[PDB]
């Protein structure tokens, strides 16, 4: 049965529940971006409408067959009503066509669903700095202080100095990175730029990031492994006996592997700046993690909350258990007081 904080109060609507069958009295079924948790049980057969962004709707039609008549695309930045509430799509800066949701309900209150988000500045120069918000369902997923991370902007210059640098001193090296869902598009792309190179992979992950509206995609991304020297592979192969095997498949083509893979956070952050990150190795493989966040650091989070100053705050991620909730409820609490809302 579906959870309280994927439920929006005074209206028909749900957000991101999809897995639970038909939800009582639920009218329309919003999806902030397609990623398998959130999107989890949309199929051709769903025949309620779906309000998203072009994008996801874009990964709904071709990817999982929904019905176009079913699929609502909105603009972002715009005000549109659906079953008579006026309702704005906002840049979610988490991976491509995912969108942060504002309510403006009949009676005056104003609610704000940040689906998946990586806080940032620039956000508050958008439609949010001209109103008020009652209630905020936050994504928490890194709401402790130990996860500090560095800005995409210095992982992204670490990964391409790093893919050059190698190549540069043996021109038979492969580069490899890690995927699992859309997201991170930047850092095999960043690479095979300053390579040079196009990003080879297969024909369904091709399909996905042609469902994106990237501009110049064409020009980046290919199916011919063979012309390119920037490899993309599921998360799964990377690691040792992934990539040799790998190896193996590109003929002598190539004698070494560097391969990356962009995690969250890792612990090594705790003692660690990004310039003194460094692989694990064993034969002609390198392995390295770097942390590439689509998702708020605690320190960017608080800043986010203490701007908007919510009088109600509902945590969508790591709800269940008293100790993670407890713990949440304590910061929100010290965030309030320090800000003096
Ligand atoms: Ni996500």
Not at 244 to 260: D, E, T
Request: charged share 15%; proline share 5%.
């Amino acid at each position: 049965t579906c959870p309280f904080y994927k439920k929006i109060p005074g209206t028909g609507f749900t957000v991101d529940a999809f897995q639970y069958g038909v939800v009582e009295g639920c009218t329309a079924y919003f999806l902030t971006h397609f990623h398998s948790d959130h999107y989890a049980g949309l199929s051709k057969h769903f025949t309620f409408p779906v309000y998203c962004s072009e994008i996801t709707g874009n990964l709904l039609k071709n990817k999982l067959h929904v019905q176009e008549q079913y699929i609502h695309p909105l603009p972002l930045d715009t005000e549109c009503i659906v079953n008579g509430v006026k309702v704005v799509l906002l840049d979610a800066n988490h991976c491509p066509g995912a969108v942060m949701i504002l309510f403006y309900l009949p009676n005056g209150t104003v609610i704000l669903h940040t689906g998946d988000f990586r806080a940032d500045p620039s956000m508050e120069r958008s439609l949010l700095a001209d109103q008020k918000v009652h209630m905020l369902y936050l994504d928490t997923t890194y709401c402790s202080p130990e996860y500090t991370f560095p800005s995409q902007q210095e992982v992204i210059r670490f990964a391409i100095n790093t893919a050059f640098e190698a190549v540069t001193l043996n021109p038979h090296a492969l580069v490899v990175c890690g995927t699992y869902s859309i997201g991170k598009e930047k850092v095999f792309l960043a690479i095979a730029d300053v390579l040079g190179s196009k990003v080879g992979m297969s024909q369904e992950k091709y399909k996905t990031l042609q469902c994106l509206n990237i501009p110049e995609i064409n020009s980046l991304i290919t199916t011919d492994m063979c012309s390119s020297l920037v490899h993309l592979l599921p998360m799964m192969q990377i690691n040792f006996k992934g990539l040799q095997s790998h190896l193996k498949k590109c003929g002598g083509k190539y004698n070494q592997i560097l391969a990356f893979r962009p995690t969250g956070w890792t612990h090594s952050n705790k003692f660690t700046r990004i310039a003194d990150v460094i692989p694990q190795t064993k034969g002609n493989i390198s392995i390295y993690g770097i942390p590439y966040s689509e998702h708020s650091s605690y320190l960017e989070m608080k800043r986010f909350v203490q701007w908007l100053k919510p009088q109600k705050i509902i945590p969508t991620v790591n709800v269940g258990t008293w100790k993670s909730r407890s713990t949440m409820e304590k910061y929100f609490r010290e965030w309030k007081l320090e800000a003096g809302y």
